């Protein structure tokens, strides 16, 4: 089996979870926080500076400082993710793989 660089990130049907990156160092200028798909390769929501902001409904909606809020899930509300973070200029800094998964207990 090919082993990913991903966090298994858990929640049972009908709940609130955030998609939230580590406390990595910043020098001068950081703006965009994108959450896209692994299997499709597809920017479902993404944030920048009042210029191309994909954001949709409250069930998958990405915070401005650098976070996400999934407000009310289920099996059809979730997906597998990869984060990519870009500056005020647009230069790829922090990139890391992720997975919203559903509990079976």
Swiss-Prot record:
Report the superkingdom from the record.
Answer: Eukaryota
Annotated region (CD58 binding region 1), positions in chain: 37-51
Chain residue ranges for the region called CD58 binding region 2: 82-96
Give the Ig-like V-type domain ranges. 1-104
Query: What is the tissue localization of expression for this protein?
Result: Expressed in natural killer cells (at protein level).
Localization, per the record, is:
Cell membrane
Where does the record say carbohydrate is attached? 65
Result after altering residue 86 to D: Loss of CD58 and CD59 binding
Q: What does this protein do?
A: CD2 interacts with lymphocyte function-associated antigen CD58 (LFA-3) and CD48/BCM1 to mediate adhesion between T-cells and other cell types. CD2 is implicated in the triggering of T-cells, the cytoplasmic domain is implicated in the signaling function.
How does this polypeptide assemble, per the annotation?
Answer: Interacts with CD48. Interacts with CD58 (LFA-3). Interacts with CD2AP. Interacts with PSTPIP1. Interacts with FCGR3A; this interaction modulates NK cell activation and cytotoxicity.
Name this protein carries in UniProt: T-cell surface antigen CD2
Q: Which organism is it from?
A: Homo sapiens (Human)
Q: What is the lineage of its organism?
A: Eukaryota, Metazoa, Chordata, Craniata, Vertebrata
Encoding gene per record:
CD2
User: In terms of the whole protein, what range is present?
Assistant: 25 to 129 of 351
């Amino acid at each position: 089996k090919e082993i990913t660089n991903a966090l298994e990130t858990w929640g049972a049907l009908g709940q609130d979870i955030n998609l939230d990156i580590p406390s990595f160092q910043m020098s001068d200028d950081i703006d965009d926080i994108k959450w896209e798909k692994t299997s499709d390769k597809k920017k479902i929501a993404q944030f920048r500076k009042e210029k191309e902001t994909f954001k949709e409904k409250d069930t998958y909606k990405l915070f401005k400082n650098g976070t996400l809020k999934i407000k009310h899930l289920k099996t059809d509300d979730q997906d597998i993710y990869k984060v990519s973070i870009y500056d005020t200029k647009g230069k790829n800094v922090l990139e890391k793989i992720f997975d919203l998964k559903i509990q079976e207990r």
